[PDB]
């Protein structure tokens, strides 16, 4: 009365590693004393009809063994489903199951966690952080994303977006409001992502950049006329030596903040030795030229004072 | 009739994970009986017979031999090919088998540079680099070949293949390009073949097509800022050129300063027609008095007559 062993074997792959047009799965129940032995094929826990499989018993000597075969199109198999083969013997239930094997070296997943903008954190006083994950397998409801705080203090209610991409990927983003003081006084905020496809869970962390805070130094510009060529003018701003990098920058017109799409502003870039710098360009128009000739380039930054802002202006005299 | 061989393998579990030992099974079936010899080849070479073991079932006319080899998960995952070779009545029959290939691997990147305006125009010895990253860490498998749209021959290339620390291979070849040919049409083509590529890669680069426009320069100086007397910063705005490819340098005492001394930006999108960049330099005491003048130079295609533009500035 050997408890029967059950083992599944399958069509192999050709010399170059490729898959064959059909995939055969052969369930093997070997090493047993005869009787009733009932084989059954589950797909992902569901049943599929007995008319896709065949059974063969062979009794050799005292022992006994049964083999059963199920055929699969390449597509079904590459659709990554678990197929279980389940035998009933003596009231017991034995089973073995199989799906296709894991990629040995697949892509691969990127997770980005932002810090809140100096604008958002100082001016609007509604600072938020964002967690972003790209290149997940395009199946919703598998991804799990949780926020923490190093202090274990309670966190606000976040808001999630799972969005299926054009290139057959899935991108999930959750954004969180953060306690506006808590950011400034210490406080590491954590973003944790788990997926079955990922080997370990992904943790990304974010926090106030520790360092030697120094304020920005702004200078306002414009280019001399290249006359007869169209109209208007172009003007730009050089804001530099600040620490740390986090900076917001904007242009008003008589206290009207101009849309981000109006000015092209660069990303904070390093300097040889100490400090960072940005440069931002705005092309004005002849209407506002005369309307009021003043234009303001403002920098929100942590170390600016009093209000964490430094303004400046310029025209053509 | 002749018989037929198929191979079968131990299978991965529900979680799609390998087990510690991969059994491979040869099934020769459907033949006239008698002499049946089975060899196992690992990678195209014979194996020690000890872990290879045969057996033969028959009913009436139907007759099926089976041989079985066991492998360790390690050996299987070492990317070896396993050939089952059947000698029957002085003939041979074959099936081989390998680990099943990845469904969604990354995947390899390839980048082809254009030469720099500096490289073209000033020191006239332009080149392009075709760089290929994330190849499998094994040498001599890769084939990288240069060629032209014009069917005309190419200069000799130089080729490095250097194993990276993260277990990839980066193979990089630079090709001297004709300083003339580049300006008259002339698409250069880079082509890499590797066993692990489903298809050959090709990248191709050429002079960017468009309405050539010269650059406009604006030099500068900063209002002194408190606490730094002896450190002053200089600016150069360069705007509305085309195409985007632009070189930029700075000249003190009529000598080119190290490209590490200043920092230019990447030519970015104008809202209108054109492209623009910005570059800053940071000078000091010594530079103050050597002479005080500073050149901000841009080498551009549409620059004229000599393919450069320079604006001078001081304090």
């Amino acid at each position, epitope marked *: 009365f050997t408890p029967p062993t059950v083992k599944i074997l399958q069509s192999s792959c050709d010399g170059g590693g490729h*898959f064959p*047009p059909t995939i055969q799965l052969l369930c093997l129940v070997s090493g047993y004393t005869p009787g009733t032995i009932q084989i059954t094929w589950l797909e992902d826990g569901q049943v599929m009809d007995v008319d896709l499989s065949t059974a063969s018993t062979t009794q050799e000597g005292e022992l006994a063994s049964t083999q059963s075969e199920l055929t699969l199109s*390449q*597509k079904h198999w*590459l*659709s*990554d489903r678990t197929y279980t083969c389940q035998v009933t013997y003596q009231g017991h239930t034995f089973e073995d199951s199989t799906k296709k094997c894991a*990629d040995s070296n*697949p892509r691969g997943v990127s997770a980005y966690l932002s810090r809140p903008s100096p604008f958002d954190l100082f001016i609007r006083k509604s600072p938020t952080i964002t967690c972003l994950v790209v290149d997940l*397998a*395009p199946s919703k409801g598998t991804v799990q994303l949780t926020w923490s705080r190093a202090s274990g203090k309670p966190v606000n209610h976040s808001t999630r977006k799972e*969005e*299926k*991409q*054009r*290139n*057959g*990927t899935l991108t999930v983003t959750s954004t969180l409001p953060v306690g506006t003081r808590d950011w400034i006084e210490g406080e590491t905020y954590q973003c944790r992502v788990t997926h079955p*496809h990922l080997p370990r869970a992904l943790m990304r962390s974010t926090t106030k950049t520790s360092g030697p805070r120094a304020a920005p130094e702004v200078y306002a510009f414009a280019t001399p006329e290249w006359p007869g060529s169209r109209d208007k003018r172009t003007l730009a701003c050089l804001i530099q030596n600040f620490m740390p990098e986090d900076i917001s920058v904007q242009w008003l017109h008589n206290e009207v903040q101009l849309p981000d799409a109006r000015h092209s502003t660069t990303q904070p870039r390093k300097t040889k030795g100490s400090g960072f710098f940005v440069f931002s360009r705005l092309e004005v128009t002849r209407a506002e030229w005369e309307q009021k000739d003043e234009f303001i380039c403002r920098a929100v930054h942590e170390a600016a004072s009093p209000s964490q802002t430094v303004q400046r202006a310029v025209s053509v005299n | 009739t002749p018989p037929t061989v198929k191979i079968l393998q131990s299978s991965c579990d529900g979680g799609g994970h390998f087990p510690p030992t991969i059994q491979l099974l040869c099934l020769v079936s459907g033949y006239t009986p008698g002499t049946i010899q089975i060899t196992w080849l690992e990678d195209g070479q014979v194996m020690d017979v000890d872990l290879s073991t045969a057996s033969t079932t028959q009913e009436g006319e139907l007759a099926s031999t089976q041989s079985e080899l066991t492998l360790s998960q390690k050996h299987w995952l070492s990317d070896r090919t396993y050939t089952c070779q059947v000698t029957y009545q002085g003939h041979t029959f074959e099936d081989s088998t390998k680990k099943c290939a990845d*469904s*969604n691997p990354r*995947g390899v990147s390839a980048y082809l540079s254009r030469p720099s305006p500096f490289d073209l125009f000033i020191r006239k010895s332009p080149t392009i680099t075709c760089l290929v990253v994330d190849l499998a860490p094994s040498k001599g498998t890769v084939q990288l070949t240069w060629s032209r749209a014009s069917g005309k021959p190419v200069n000799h290339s130089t080729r490095k293949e250097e194993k990276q620390r993260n277990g990839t291979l980066t193979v990089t070849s630079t090709l001297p390009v004709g300083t003339r040919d580049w300006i008259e049409g002339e698409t250069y083509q880079c082509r890499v073949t590797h066993p692990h590529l*489903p*298809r050959a890669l090709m*990248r191709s680069t050429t002079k960017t*097509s*468009g309405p050539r426009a010269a650059p406009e320069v604006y030099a500068f100086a900063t209002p002194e800022w408190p606490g730094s007397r002896d450190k002053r910063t200089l600016a150069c705005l360069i705007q509305n050129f085309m195409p985007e490819d632009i070189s930029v340098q700075w000249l003190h005492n009529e000598v080119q300063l190290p490209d590490a001394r200043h920092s230019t930006t990447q030519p970015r999108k104008t809202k209108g027609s054109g492209f623009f960049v910005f570059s800053r330099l940071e000078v000091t005491r010594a530079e103050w008095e050597q002479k005080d003048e500073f050149i901000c130079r841009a080498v551009h295609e549409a620059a004229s007559p000599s393919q450069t533009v320079q604006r001078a500035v001081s304090v």
Partner: antibody
Amino acid sequence: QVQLQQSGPGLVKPSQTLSLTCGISGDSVSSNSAAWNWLRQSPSRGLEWLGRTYYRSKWYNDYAVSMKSRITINPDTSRNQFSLQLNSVTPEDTAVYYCARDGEISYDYYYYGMDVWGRGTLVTVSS
Amino acid sequence: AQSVLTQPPSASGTPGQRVTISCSGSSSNIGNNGVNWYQQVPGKPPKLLIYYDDLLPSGVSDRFSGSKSGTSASLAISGLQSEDEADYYCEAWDDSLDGVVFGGGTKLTVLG
């Protein structure tokens, strides 16, 4: 180069199912980094997308939904082709059907466009 | 019933001038994703012109341009010709449908 070739019947009885297959050369149906679409055009309903199939770690399908209840796209990976099957047709299902390749261009990439097309096939629904 | 992205059924030109075609949609499609344009000279299959709002691929004329702001987009043809009479189609990827979404079509006539 890449190339797509349609084929199938051009006459379907009402209530029956249309089948049209599209074989490709110059690429693989099973390829990552691209995707395989079925589209249709009638002067009445304009140009109209039906479905898509493509492989990453698994086979995925995206249907129009719109009509997902009558349609199956699914690849024959041996013959390197993919096939559209639409159930229960009516005259409204008369159109010129196109198979097309949605994949990338290069460089910056991530950007998809359906840049390769089949000649089209005229399917007409009648008794 | 009718389509998802909205574009005017008719547009017109004179052999030297520049005309634009409008494309309106939602955030689920044009807002969070990029836009493609196609040209159709019927009995023939569609031919790609613009991709991800701004781009021109190989074998395409630079007088063909494109733009996008918010939930809408525009295709600008300048310096027209005779073979420019065509059905012109815009499309984007809608990620609340998981699917490709097209425009109604715009028939482009050139008189003169």
